Chains A and B, each alone.
Chain A
């Protein structure tokens, strides 16, 4: 038994997922006056949720079908609301901000999770937090803010961070009190989010517009489909890595994956970055790694 693939599969899958997301959301469809921007975040998130739910169903039906799910449906619905809210808010924010900024902001999960835990759950962090978390804040203030009001994009990113913190709190509570497996939770929350997003797109009137837009630029279809696939397989790998190595291994793996994704976005796509902004990303990632190691 060899486990390099715990690194290789997750890294490749999520790296390609990030590249496809950048190519889709920030792509320059059309030209000149005919140029159009991808404003259909709901449809993208709905497709991703559908693909993830299908893969989760396959995984549970083929892997470890003996387990019985003790969780309550309403808990799954409540978690899925925040989960899909976070995903939609982040994807919509990506329309305004660059991709490096989007990923860096979405990486700062520890700050909202600590705030939620201390303010609501009352858990105290002697050394796990309050140290290497101020490092993350310093890095963000170095990158997002510079010496030389905030727009819609960072507001939406902050909202996504808050929703992600709420989702994490709910998931932790349900895991503790109902012993829910990763595959079952992933399937259920993805199904609930798929239903909610289907209702939202159908009633909002965005499905017709998205279909017309795709008809205008058919290639995007392929892209988004691949994107969805890369969001599933990699996720599955992470699940395995959760049960094979442990949580710390998964955390460090995703941290290095995010760093390499930022590097790829900066270099391949010619996203403009400058000195004293690289320092912010370095500080953020160092703080995230130290927090993962301790606590």
Chain B
């Protein structure tokens, strides 16, 4: 699978400076002249916010400050008039191959320091190893039978995202080949929910699981995100801590 590398681990920048974050892919991510790259922004304790698709196309509603550039295996995200609002971790994602991969994330910090779709995730918090887990994402304000992809993603400690799987409104589903043998994604249209079931969870499965809505245009773009649910896998019952 394509490995995305973000060059600056953490950039110490001042207000007003022009900031450029560089991402690189192990393989060419171009397809008939279109660069399948996406850029997301994640504030602390919040789900990632979709910023750019196609490496140059700014999503509607994003400020004009943000811009993208590059091609082949080298891309860059530029913010010339940086303000306080654009203080976050920026992630680069490739949609060239099915196991969609995110970058390690570049943190940016300042010197001196009914009309929409609502997703809600539920599931057990603490789980013993080897047990079977089932997370349920419920959608309100929209129907999962309309033209959108519904994906399950997880972010490990250290802010390392990993797209787990997705199900399309047609019922066609795609899985991460690494996790294809451990997870199963299903849906129930009557309740307007979709579930992800994990078999034989291990200590490495501790992470924050998000359910997102995405649409395909110059790559898969997780435009809407849930609030994320924490899952901790441990052999001890957490009490008085």
Contact = CB atoms under 8 A, between A and B. Distances in A.
B32 A176 contact: yes
Given A72-B147, A175-B32, A179-B219, 20 more contacts: A66-B98, A68-B98, A68-B168, A68-B172, A68-B174, A70-B216, A172-B32, A175-B31, A176-B31, A176-B33, A176-B34, A176-B218, A177-B34, A177-B218, A178-B216, A178-B217, A179-B31, A179-B32, A179-B34, A179-B36
Nearest to A172: B32
Interface string B28-51: 000111101000000000000000
Contacts of A72: 147
A40 B123 CA distance: 63
Contacts of B33: 176
A68 B98 CA distance: 9
Contacts of A66: 98
A176 B33 CA distance: 7
A72 B215 CA distance: 11
Tell me the interface secondary structure of chain B in the complex. loop
**Candidate in A70, A72, A172 with the most chain B CB atoms within 10 angstroms:** A70
Contacts, number: 25
Interface of A: 66, 68, 70, 72, 172, 175-179
Interface of B: 31-34, 36, 98, 147, 168, 172, 174, 216-219
Nearest to A174: B32
Nearest to B177: A66
B217 A177 contact: yes
B93 to A, nearest CB: 15
A70 B215 CA distance: 9
Contacts of B219: 179
A129 to B, nearest CB: 17
A172 B147 CA distance: 23
Q: In the A-B complex, list the 8 residue pairs whose CB atoms are closest, starting with the nearest.
A: A70-B216, A176-B34, A175-B32, A176-B32, A179-B31, A68-B174, A177-B218, A176-B33
Nearest to B166: A68
23 contacts: A66-B98, A68-B98, A68-B168, A68-B172, A68-B174, A70-B216, A72-B147, A172-B32, A175-B31, A175-B32, A176-B31, A176-B32, A176-B33, A176-B34, A176-B218, A177-B217, A177-B218, A178-B216, A178-B217, A179-B31, A179-B34, A179-B36, A179-B219
